[PDB]
Amino acid sequence: MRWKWIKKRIRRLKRQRKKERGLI
Amino acid sequence: QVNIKKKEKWGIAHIYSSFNNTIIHITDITGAETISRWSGGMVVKADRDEPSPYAAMLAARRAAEEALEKGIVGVHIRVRAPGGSKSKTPGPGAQAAIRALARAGLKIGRVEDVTPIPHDGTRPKGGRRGRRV
Amino acid sequence: MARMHARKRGKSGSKRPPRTAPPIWVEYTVEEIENLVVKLRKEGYSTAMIGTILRDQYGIPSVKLFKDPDNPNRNLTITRILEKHGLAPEIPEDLMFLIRRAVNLRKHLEQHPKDLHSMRGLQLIESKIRRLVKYYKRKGKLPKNWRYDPETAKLLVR
Amino acid sequence: TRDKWKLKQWYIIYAPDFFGGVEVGLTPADDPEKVLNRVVEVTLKDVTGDFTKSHVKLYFQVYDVKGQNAYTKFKGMKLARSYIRSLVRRKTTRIDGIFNITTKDGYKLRVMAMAIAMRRIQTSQERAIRKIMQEIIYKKAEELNFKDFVLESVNGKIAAEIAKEAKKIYPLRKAEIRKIKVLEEPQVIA
RNA sequence: GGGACCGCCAGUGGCGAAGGCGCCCGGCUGGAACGGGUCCGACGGUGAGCGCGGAAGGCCAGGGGAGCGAACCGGAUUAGAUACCCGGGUAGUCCUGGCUGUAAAGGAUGCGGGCUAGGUGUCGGGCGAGCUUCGAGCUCGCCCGGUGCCGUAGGGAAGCCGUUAAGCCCGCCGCCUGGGGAGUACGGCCGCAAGGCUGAAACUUAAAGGAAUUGGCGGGGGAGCACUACAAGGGGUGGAGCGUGCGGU
């Protein structure tokens, strides 16, 4: 549970920063 | 073998007691001559009979007969255990071997603690909860 | 008492003497005792250590209670006498000693490096000195134009 | 097994000027000169005295063997785990004195000594006690010959004495010579 | 020969602001309790901001590497194991220089003071004794500070708390105002990265939560009986044919 939320957020952020980095 | 003037050989009977097997080896006082080495596996092959106390009793008894031929009639008993990433407690053959010696007619004048206990520490295998089934 | 500032425990339970009636178990005069203070100050004693001496040797209860007043400055005891003579500098003895320690510490941290505990103590002593000084400059114990920075400290010490 | 045993040769422990000699302890080996460095534990059956009783285990190492009689010097003393763990206790202190002794006889000796504090109070008097333990053991050792000193050091005479002079400063109990290791032996052979 | 660490010692124990701190010896060095207030004479308290320390692991360089061991490669277990278990094994763990900053970093109890029943133990100091191995070695009381147990007035939803307050007061700081969306988005700021700080809205909901009571339950613990229980023992069904009832047909 607790682990889930955080890593999901860290994935959510790294995909978004990936989609920010390669479409500017 | 000449130049005996002790008039009663004595042998330091070594007992290595793993949870995975029991070995019983006897040497003279020096340690420089092995007369006997008998293990649980040589007695009986079945992987569970190997540390079993009955298997250990007979292994120690065999050695003990050889020792009597030699005129080894007194024994120091030196108990140790596995220790490098194992439990440091001696297995079942300790108690079995002491019994086979007591029946066998070899009298014990000392009981000796040469077991691995560090004052520098050693970690055994676990999984952050120890071993489990 | 009790306060906390670098300890997790209370302060000592000591109190001033209440023999607030003048001595008469002393058998020395005011005059003789002053005489002693000039000689001792001159010798190399600092004004706390003189007053301790006076209590033991000459047997007074307090030095606040055998020699107040005799000069018209606040809280008349030793260093006020000396101050009129010019045997005491204006910067209180308290402050002189604090400052001396604050110099001592920079020199150890250098030679002994990796001192965490000693480093926090250097910040803490210094910090306290600025706050004490800030009040003293105003009071006239220190000049108005004086400042406490750590270089000026080293100057005084040397 | 492997041998008759007659290929194995047996040799016999004698330790002139260490105990005056013994007749107990045997070392087998295969070939001559593989017994020159072997270490032999005896409790001693030539005496049933205090060495055997309360200072249980002594080690002797056969330095050289000449003509199939083995000349032997003091290799070590120790106690066992049974003694160290028994005597120590809780809400007290354990005090130990190491010194590296030089004796004027050409032997270098290392003593560990075991002193047990009389109950309460952990104090600088402990460490003061350690200063004294080293100094006393040194003076006894310095005066005497190595055969004399070994007999005093393994026996309670030394322990009993350390406890008397220390006891005056700060009382002790249960003083012992935990082990003695012969830092360096030789002075008559290289 | 080598690296690494210090069973006993070790105690409900001691030290440090805090994170934290355990082989032994010596030097260097910081802090504290206490008794004697000897000294300045209200210099005090709090403190937005700012500044600083900050376990472990991580990041960077160099060195060290004995054992241990993410990843990893087999084996078992398991339907399969993705896991518990076993055989090997790399970074890392160690040391120094450098860098980043988190914690259920807990006493979940902000900081400073006064005040409000006691009892007992314990650590160190002051003081008067007794015992004495003549050393505070063993102990008692008064007194001063700290850590513990039991408990009053009172407080609390209750559990508890109770001179170490969640008690009675005062000064100041930090913070909250249902749950999910979301500690997300967006922007800025810091960081080398990992991350950190700040920090929404549309929408959706009649509950989310805390304590205790009672009951059921638990490859949770302890104890005990039963012959409609199990063991021992004796016969039998499931085979075949028939009789009878049911499902299906």
Side-chain angles (χ1 to χ4, degrees):
Chain A
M1 300 183 90
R2 302 298 79 85
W3 67 92
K4 307 185 171 312
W5 319 148
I6 309 192
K7 292 282 174 70
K8 198 155 74 200
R9 183 50 60 194
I10 295 179
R11 279 183 295 264
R12 269 172 288 195
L13 290 155
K14 280 159 63 190
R15 273 198 189 70
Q16 183 221 99
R17 279 167 202 169
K18 182 191 64 57
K19 291 180 304 163
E20 282 174 300
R21 183 191 169 175
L23 307 160
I24 299 184
Chain B
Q1 185 179 271
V2 290
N3 306 301
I4 326 296
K5 201 183 182 192
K6 187 169 186 179
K7 308 175 192 44
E8 180 184 322
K9 298 166 179 156
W10 193 287
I12 66 180
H14 296 267
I15 300 162
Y16 193 95
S17 305
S18 289
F19 292 88
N20 287 273
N21 185 60
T22 319
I23 306 191
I24 318 76
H25 183 289
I26 187 154
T27 57
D28 71 287
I29 191 69
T30 303
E33 186 191 80
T34 306
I35 168 61
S36 319
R37 176 177 85 69
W38 220 286
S39 63
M42 283 162 76
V43 180
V44 156
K45 289 250 65 75
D47 320 81
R48 71 192 69 150
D49 279 45
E50 289 173 48
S52 300
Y54 191 52
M57 304 190 66
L58 296 184
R61 189 63 194 104
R62 281 168 195 185
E65 296 162 42
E66 331 186 341
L68 275 162
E69 301 186 319
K70 290 300 302 179
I72 290 171
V73 290
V75 284
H76 295 323
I77 46 172
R78 288 185 50 184
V79 176
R80 46 185 315 200
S85 44
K86 283 266 314 299
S87 310
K88 296 180 173 275
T89 169
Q95 183 177 230
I98 292 176
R99 284 181 287 186
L101 275 31
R103 74 169 171 145
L106 289 165
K107 53 189 191 63
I108 297 167
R110 282 200 314 179
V111 41
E112 284 286 315
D113 302 277
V114 300
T115 321
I117 285 175
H119 183 185
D120 55 289
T122 316
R123 169 166 156 110
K125 52 185 190 197
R128 215 156 206 258
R129 203 163 282 135
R131 308 172 192 148
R132 289 169 290 178
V133 168
Chain C
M1 297 173 275
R3 205 184 64 92
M4 286 91 162
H5 204 80
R7 48 188 162 271
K8 70 297 298 295
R9 288 185 162 162
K11 293 173 68 183
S12 282
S14 297
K15 53 280 309 300
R16 218 174 46 86
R19 274 65 71 163
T20 43
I24 204 157
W25 52 69
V26 187
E27 75 284 3
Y28 301 116
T29 62
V30 182
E31 294 195 81
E32 293 171 283
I33 204 178
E34 283 157 3
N35 208 51
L36 199 100
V37 165
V38 172
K39 295 272 77 46
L40 299 161
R41 188 50 178 190
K42 176 77 55 169
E43 200 183 275
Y45 275 113
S46 315
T47 191
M49 320 168 164
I50 310 169
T52 301
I53 279 174
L54 298 177
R55 172 162 54 82
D56 293 325
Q57 293 180 167
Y58 249 57
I60 64 185
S62 191
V63 195
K64 290 188 75 63
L65 285 178
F66 188 50
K67 298 174 71 168
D68 188 56
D70 48 77
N71 267 288
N73 305 125
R74 56 162 66 252
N75 283 244
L76 220 299
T77 187
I78 330 182
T79 197
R80 320 302 322 127
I81 313 177
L82 306 174
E83 196 55 72
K84 302 282 184 197
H85 312 187
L87 292 166
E90 204 186 68
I91 175 165
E93 198 57 55
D94 302 285
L95 217 45
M96 295 175 59
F97 287 117
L98 287 149
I99 297 171
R100 176 58 287 263
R101 299 167 268 150
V103 168
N104 192 256
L105 282 161
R106 302 137 179 167
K107 310 302 156 318
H108 172 92
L109 291 168
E110 294 154 2
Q111 291 178 10
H112 296 80
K114 202 189 62 168
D115 293 287
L116 186 66
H117 193 232
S118 201
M119 172 264 156
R120 173 267 186 174
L122 180 50
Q123 301 171 307
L124 184 73
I125 187 190
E126 301 185 65
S127 65
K128 285 168 58 179
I129 315 160
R130 287 185 279 274
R131 200 178 189 192
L132 296 178
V133 152
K134 271 176 180 291
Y135 178 66
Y136 292 133
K137 270 191 305 179
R138 288 197 59 183
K139 185 59 177 186
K141 299 298 280 79
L142 284 180
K144 296 260 178 286
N145 50 265
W146 171 267
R147 69 195 63 260
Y148 179 76
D149 60 73
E151 294 295 309
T152 209
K154 291 168 181 186
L155 203 70
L156 280 186
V157 160
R158 305 171 290 115
Chain D
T1 319
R2 200 181 271 154
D3 310 281
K4 180 159 171 176
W5 298 259
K6 289 289 169 177
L7 288 149
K8 305 290 287 168
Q9 300 300 285
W10 292 47
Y11 293 101
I12 196 279
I13 306 299
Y14 250 78
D17 307 311
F18 296 108
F19 201 73
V22 274
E23 62 172 291
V24 165
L26 296 150
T27 297
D30 193 64
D31 313 307
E33 299 295 61
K34 293 303 154 55
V35 48
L36 59 149
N37 206 18
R38 299 283 217 182
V39 177
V40 201
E41 58 179 70
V42 275
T43 331
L44 303 159
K45 303 191 299 200
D46 317 83
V47 264
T48 187
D50 292 77
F51 305 79
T52 300
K53 285 161 169 194
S54 36
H55 309 112
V56 172
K57 203 144 60 174
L58 286 177
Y59 288 107
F60 294 86
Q61 174 188 98
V62 18
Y63 199 111
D64 303 311
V65 181
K66 290 87 160 182
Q68 310 189 282
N69 303 297
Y71 177 89
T72 305
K73 301 191 187 194
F74 186 35
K75 169 54 185 192
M77 175 255 184
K78 210 172 182 293
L79 301 173
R81 279 194 185 97
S82 301
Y83 283 81
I84 171 55
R85 194 54 194 105
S86 285
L87 300 171
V88 293
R89 202 190 78 185
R90 304 169 75 181
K91 294 164 166 59
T92 183
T93 26
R94 201 188 80 90
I95 301 177
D96 197 282
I98 161 64
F99 196 75
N100 301 307
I101 308 164
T102 185
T103 66
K104 61 183 220 301
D105 296 78
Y107 291 101
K108 302 290 160 282
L109 190 61
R110 179 187 277 115
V111 280
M112 306 181 81
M114 181 212 306
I116 305 292
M118 170 49 175
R119 301 172 58 87
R120 306 179 319 153
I121 310 175
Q122 295 189 122
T123 178
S124 72
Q125 301 190 56
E126 179 177 26
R127 299 62 176 199
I129 252 75
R130 289 193 162 100
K131 304 170 186 61
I132 306 158
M133 291 169 56
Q134 298 157 10
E135 189 261 297
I136 199 71
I137 298 169
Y138 196 56
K139 201 64 64 271
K140 297 156 162 291
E142 180 189 5
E143 195 184 65
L144 296 187
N145 291 53
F146 186 48
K147 59 180 203 287
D148 290 306
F149 192 60
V150 153
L151 299 163
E152 172 161 14
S153 199
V154 179
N155 188 241
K157 189 173 168 304
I158 204 158
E161 200 76 70
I162 290 171
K164 297 192 187 55
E165 287 163 312
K167 181 168 92 173
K168 307 196 167 302
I169 322 303
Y170 183 93
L172 283 175
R173 54 166 182 257
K174 301 164 162 173
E176 279 279 311
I177 309 300
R178 183 163 65 157
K179 47 182 301 183
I180 302 178
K181 181 174 180 191
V182 193
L183 221 162
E184 188 194 62
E185 295 158 286
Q187 44 75 238
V188 64
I189 184 65

PDB file of all heavy atoms in Angstrom, chain D residues 54-73:
ATOM      1  N   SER D  54      43.665 -25.605  39.333  1.00  0.00           N
ATOM      2  CA  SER D  54      42.992 -24.302  39.237  1.00  0.00           C
ATOM      3  C   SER D  54      43.532 -23.435  38.188  1.00  0.00           C
ATOM      4  O   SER D  54      43.121 -22.288  38.085  1.00  0.00           O
ATOM      5  CB  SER D  54      43.014 -23.533  40.596  1.00  0.00           C
ATOM      6  OG  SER D  54      44.214 -23.768  41.249  1.00  0.00           O
ATOM      7  N   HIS D  55      44.476 -24.001  37.314  1.00  0.00           N
ATOM      8  CA  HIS D  55      45.148 -23.192  36.305  1.00  0.00           C
ATOM      9  C   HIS D  55      45.173 -24.058  35.053  1.00  0.00           C
ATOM     10  O   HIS D  55      46.066 -24.037  34.245  1.00  0.00           O
ATOM     11  CB  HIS D  55      46.552 -22.775  36.717  1.00  0.00           C
ATOM     12  CG  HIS D  55      46.591 -22.147  38.095  1.00  0.00           C
ATOM     13  ND1 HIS D  55      47.209 -22.744  39.188  1.00  0.00           N
ATOM     14  CD2 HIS D  55      46.118 -20.975  38.582  1.00  0.00           C
ATOM     15  CE1 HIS D  55      47.068 -21.919  40.242  1.00  0.00           C
ATOM     16  NE2 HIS D  55      46.424 -20.794  39.930  1.00  0.00           N
ATOM     17  N   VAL D  56      44.235 -24.951  35.067  1.00  0.00           N
ATOM     18  CA  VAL D  56      43.862 -25.965  34.121  1.00  0.00           C
ATOM     19  C   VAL D  56      44.173 -25.708  32.606  1.00  0.00           C
ATOM     20  O   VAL D  56      43.657 -24.740  32.096  1.00  0.00           O
ATOM     21  CB  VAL D  56      42.333 -26.305  34.070  1.00  0.00           C
ATOM     22  CG1 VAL D  56      41.821 -27.217  32.976  1.00  0.00           C
ATOM     23  CG2 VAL D  56      42.048 -26.968  35.446  1.00  0.00           C
ATOM     24  N   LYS D  57      45.055 -26.545  32.036  1.00  0.00           N
ATOM     25  CA  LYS D  57      45.660 -26.499  30.724  1.00  0.00           C
ATOM     26  C   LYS D  57      47.016 -25.848  30.968  1.00  0.00           C
ATOM     27  O   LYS D  57      47.086 -24.841  31.660  1.00  0.00           O
ATOM     28  CB  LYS D  57      44.884 -25.764  29.615  1.00  0.00           C
ATOM     29  CG  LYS D  57      45.327 -26.256  28.222  1.00  0.00           C
ATOM     30  CD  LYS D  57      44.217 -26.331  27.203  1.00  0.00           C
ATOM     31  CE  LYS D  57      43.512 -24.965  26.932  1.00  0.00           C
ATOM     32  NZ  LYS D  57      42.575 -25.147  25.838  1.00  0.00           N
ATOM     33  N   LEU D  58      48.147 -26.372  30.425  1.00  0.00           N
ATOM     34  CA  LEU D  58      49.359 -25.717  30.158  1.00  0.00           C
ATOM     35  C   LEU D  58      49.850 -26.207  28.836  1.00  0.00           C
ATOM     36  O   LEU D  58      49.649 -27.389  28.602  1.00  0.00           O
ATOM     37  CB  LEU D  58      50.437 -25.996  31.250  1.00  0.00           C
ATOM     38  CG  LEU D  58      50.300 -25.311  32.606  1.00  0.00           C
ATOM     39  CD1 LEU D  58      51.411 -25.760  33.605  1.00  0.00           C
ATOM     40  CD2 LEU D  58      50.237 -23.815  32.464  1.00  0.00           C
ATOM     41  N   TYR D  59      50.485 -25.331  28.002  1.00  0.00           N
ATOM     42  CA  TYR D  59      50.925 -25.684  26.767  1.00  0.00           C
ATOM     43  C   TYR D  59      52.397 -25.620  26.780  1.00  0.00           C
ATOM     44  O   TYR D  59      52.994 -24.594  27.212  1.00  0.00           O
ATOM     45  CB  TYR D  59      50.594 -24.692  25.583  1.00  0.00           C
ATOM     46  CG  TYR D  59      49.183 -24.752  25.270  1.00  0.00           C
ATOM     47  CD1 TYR D  59      48.340 -23.663  25.638  1.00  0.00           C
ATOM     48  CD2 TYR D  59      48.734 -25.820  24.422  1.00  0.00           C
ATOM     49  CE1 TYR D  59      46.978 -23.761  25.246  1.00  0.00           C
ATOM     50  CE2 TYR D  59      47.406 -25.859  24.025  1.00  0.00           C
ATOM     51  CZ  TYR D  59      46.529 -24.809  24.363  1.00  0.00           C
ATOM     52  OH  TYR D  59      45.232 -24.812  23.854  1.00  0.00           O
ATOM     53  N   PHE D  60      53.053 -26.593  26.129  1.00  0.00           N
ATOM     54  CA  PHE D  60      54.509 -26.595  26.084  1.00  0.00           C
ATOM     55  C   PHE D  60      54.768 -26.890  24.662  1.00  0.00           C
ATOM     56  O   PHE D  60      54.034 -27.621  24.045  1.00  0.00           O
ATOM     57  CB  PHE D  60      55.277 -27.592  27.007  1.00  0.00           C
ATOM     58  CG  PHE D  60      55.074 -27.253  28.408  1.00  0.00           C
ATOM     59  CD1 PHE D  60      53.929 -27.750  29.101  1.00  0.00           C
ATOM     60  CD2 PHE D  60      56.022 -26.517  29.165  1.00  0.00           C
ATOM     61  CE1 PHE D  60      53.715 -27.465  30.437  1.00  0.00           C
ATOM     62  CE2 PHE D  60      55.718 -26.012  30.463  1.00  0.00           C
ATOM     63  CZ  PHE D  60      54.551 -26.499  31.086  1.00  0.00           C
ATOM     64  N   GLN D  61      55.866 -26.246  24.103  1.00  0.00           N
ATOM     65  CA  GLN D  61      56.148 -26.517  22.678  1.00  0.00           C
ATOM     66  C   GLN D  61      57.546 -27.077  22.713  1.00  0.00           C
ATOM     67  O   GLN D  61      58.381 -26.623  23.445  1.00  0.00           O
ATOM     68  CB  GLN D  61      56.232 -25.198  21.809  1.00  0.00           C
ATOM     69  CG  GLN D  61      56.662 -25.290  20.331  1.00  0.00           C
ATOM     70  CD  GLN D  61      56.901 -23.917  19.660  1.00  0.00           C
ATOM     71  OE1 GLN D  61      58.090 -23.454  19.552  1.00  0.00           O
ATOM     72  NE2 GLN D  61      55.775 -23.232  19.177  1.00  0.00           N
ATOM     73  N   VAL D  62      57.684 -28.181  21.956  1.00  0.00           N
ATOM     74  CA  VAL D  62      58.946 -28.884  21.837  1.00  0.00           C
ATOM     75  C   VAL D  62      59.628 -28.073  20.831  1.00  0.00           C
ATOM     76  O   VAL D  62      59.124 -27.912  19.724  1.00  0.00           O
ATOM     77  CB  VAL D  62      58.845 -30.276  21.393  1.00  0.00           C
ATOM     78  CG1 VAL D  62      57.506 -30.572  20.723  1.00  0.00           C
ATOM     79  CG2 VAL D  62      60.121 -30.852  20.666  1.00  0.00           C
ATOM     80  N   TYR D  63      60.731 -27.369  21.219  1.00  0.00           N
ATOM     81  CA  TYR D  63      61.513 -26.539  20.433  1.00  0.00           C
ATOM     82  C   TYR D  63      62.459 -27.398  19.602  1.00  0.00           C
ATOM     83  O   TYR D  63      62.450 -27.252  18.361  1.00  0.00           O
ATOM     84  CB  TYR D  63      62.231 -25.490  21.366  1.00  0.00           C
ATOM     85  CG  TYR D  63      62.713 -24.295  20.538  1.00  0.00           C
ATOM     86  CD1 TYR D  63      62.097 -23.026  20.699  1.00  0.00           C
ATOM     87  CD2 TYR D  63      63.690 -24.416  19.474  1.00  0.00           C
ATOM     88  CE1 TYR D  63      62.431 -21.902  19.899  1.00  0.00           C
ATOM     89  CE2 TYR D  63      64.036 -23.254  18.706  1.00  0.00           C
ATOM     90  CZ  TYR D  63      63.339 -22.063  18.864  1.00  0.00           C
ATOM     91  OH  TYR D  63      63.415 -20.910  18.001  1.00  0.00           O
ATOM     92  N   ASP D  64      63.114 -28.363  20.191  1.00  0.00           N
ATOM     93  CA  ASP D  64      64.145 -29.218  19.460  1.00  0.00           C
ATOM     94  C   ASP D  64      64.019 -30.574  19.978  1.00  0.00           C
ATOM     95  O   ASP D  64      63.591 -30.626  21.129  1.00  0.00           O
ATOM     96  CB  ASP D  64      65.613 -28.716  19.633  1.00  0.00           C
ATOM     97  CG  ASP D  64      65.943 -27.286  19.228  1.00  0.00           C
ATOM     98  OD1 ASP D  64      65.535 -26.938  18.102  1.00  0.00           O
ATOM     99  OD2 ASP D  64      66.711 -26.634  20.021  1.00  0.00           O
ATOM    100  N   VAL D  65      64.433 -31.674  19.254  1.00  0.00           N
ATOM    101  CA  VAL D  65      64.449 -32.980  19.736  1.00  0.00           C
ATOM    102  C   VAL D  65      65.806 -33.582  19.349  1.00  0.00           C
ATOM    103  O   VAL D  65      66.288 -33.345  18.247  1.00  0.00           O
ATOM    104  CB  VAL D  65      63.389 -33.879  19.068  1.00  0.00           C
ATOM    105  CG1 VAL D  65      63.443 -35.293  19.670  1.00  0.00           C
ATOM    106  CG2 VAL D  65      61.869 -33.393  19.353  1.00  0.00           C
ATOM    107  N   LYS D  66      66.476 -34.201  20.386  1.00  0.00           N
ATOM    108  CA  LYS D  66      67.871 -34.578  20.310  1.00  0.00           C
ATOM    109  C   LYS D  66      67.900 -35.985  20.752  1.00  0.00           C
ATOM    110  O   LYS D  66      67.699 -36.347  21.920  1.00  0.00           O
ATOM    111  CB  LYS D  66      68.865 -33.764  21.185  1.00  0.00           C
ATOM    112  CG  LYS D  66      69.232 -32.275  20.896  1.00  0.00           C
ATOM    113  CD  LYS D  66      68.295 -31.179  21.508  1.00  0.00           C
ATOM    114  CE  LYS D  66      68.998 -29.834  21.574  1.00  0.00           C
ATOM    115  NZ  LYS D  66      68.142 -28.817  22.201  1.00  0.00           N
ATOM    116  N   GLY D  67      68.199 -36.874  19.818  1.00  0.00           N
ATOM    117  CA  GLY D  67      68.533 -38.245  19.962  1.00  0.00           C
ATOM    118  C   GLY D  67      67.328 -39.091  20.196  1.00  0.00           C
ATOM    119  O   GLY D  67      67.423 -40.234  20.637  1.00  0.00           O
ATOM    120  N   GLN D  68      66.136 -38.483  19.992  1.00  0.00           N
ATOM    121  CA  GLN D  68      64.742 -39.003  20.145  1.00  0.00           C
ATOM    122  C   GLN D  68      64.328 -38.800  21.562  1.00  0.00           C
ATOM    123  O   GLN D  68      63.470 -39.597  21.956  1.00  0.00           O
ATOM    124  CB  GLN D  68      64.439 -40.411  19.571  1.00  0.00           C
ATOM    125  CG  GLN D  68      64.869 -40.721  18.106  1.00  0.00           C
ATOM    126  CD  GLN D  68      64.187 -42.120  17.847  1.00  0.00           C
ATOM    127  OE1 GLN D  68      64.718 -43.105  18.325  1.00  0.00           O
ATOM    128  NE2 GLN D  68      62.966 -42.088  17.130  1.00  0.00           N
ATOM    129  N   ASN D  69      64.864 -37.737  22.235  1.00  0.00           N
ATOM    130  CA  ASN D  69      64.344 -37.192  23.473  1.00  0.00           C
ATOM    131  C   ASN D  69      64.181 -35.781  23.229  1.00  0.00           C
ATOM    132  O   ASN D  69      65.051 -35.125  22.668  1.00  0.00           O
ATOM    133  CB  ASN D  69      65.333 -37.456  24.612  1.00  0.00           C
ATOM    134  CG  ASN D  69      65.577 -38.993  24.684  1.00  0.00           C
ATOM    135  OD1 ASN D  69      64.571 -39.681  24.968  1.00  0.00           O
ATOM    136  ND2 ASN D  69      66.806 -39.500  24.410  1.00  0.00           N
ATOM    137  N   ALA D  70      63.021 -35.235  23.682  1.00  0.00           N
ATOM    138  CA  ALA D  70      62.438 -33.941  23.230  1.00  0.00           C
ATOM    139  C   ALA D  70      62.693 -32.898  24.344  1.00  0.00           C
ATOM    140  O   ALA D  70      62.499 -33.135  25.545  1.00  0.00           O
ATOM    141  CB  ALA D  70      60.923 -34.162  22.846  1.00  0.00           C
ATOM    142  N   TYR D  71      63.325 -31.785  23.902  1.00  0.00           N
ATOM    143  CA  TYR D  71      63.715 -30.737  24.866  1.00  0.00           C
ATOM    144  C   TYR D  71      62.706 -29.659  24.538  1.00  0.00           C
ATOM    145  O   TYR D  71      62.399 -29.448  23.348  1.00  0.00           O
ATOM    146  CB  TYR D  71      65.216 -30.287  24.582  1.00  0.00           C
ATOM    147  CG  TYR D  71      65.712 -29.170  25.473  1.00  0.00           C
ATOM    148  CD1 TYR D  71      66.303 -29.439  26.679  1.00  0.00           C
ATOM    149  CD2 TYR D  71      65.410 -27.833  25.212  1.00  0.00           C
ATOM    150  CE1 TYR D  71      66.906 -28.401  27.437  1.00  0.00           C
ATOM    151  CE2 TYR D  71      65.809 -26.773  26.097  1.00  0.00           C
ATOM    152  CZ  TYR D  71      66.459 -27.102  27.250  1.00  0.00           C
ATOM    153  OH  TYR D  71      66.828 -26.088  28.159  1.00  0.00           O
ATOM    154  N   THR D  72      62.131 -29.094  25.588  1.00  0.00           N
ATOM    155  CA  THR D  72      60.891 -28.448  25.566  1.00  0.00           C
ATOM    156  C   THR D  72      60.906 -27.213  26.437  1.00  0.00           C
ATOM    157  O   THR D  72      61.487 -27.243  27.494  1.00  0.00           O
ATOM    158  CB  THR D  72      59.830 -29.472  26.011  1.00  0.00           C
ATOM    159  OG1 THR D  72      59.788 -30.671  25.281  1.00  0.00           O
ATOM    160  CG2 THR D  72      58.448 -28.851  25.757  1.00  0.00           C
ATOM    161  N   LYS D  73      60.297 -26.134  25.999  1.00  0.00           N
ATOM    162  CA  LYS D  73      60.286 -24.971  26.749  1.00  0.00           C
ATOM    163  C   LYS D  73      58.857 -24.566  26.877  1.00  0.00           C
ATOM    164  O   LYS D  73      57.967 -25.176  26.299  1.00  0.00           O
ATOM    165  CB  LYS D  73      60.976 -23.744  26.041  1.00  0.00           C
ATOM    166  CG  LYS D  73      62.430 -24.033  25.700  1.00  0.00           C
ATOM    167  CD  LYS D  73      63.092 -22.732  25.291  1.00  0.00           C
ATOM    168  CE  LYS D  73      64.552 -22.776  24.723  1.00  0.00           C
ATOM    169  NZ  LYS D  73      65.178 -21.503  24.662  1.00  0.00           N
TER     170      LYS D  73
END
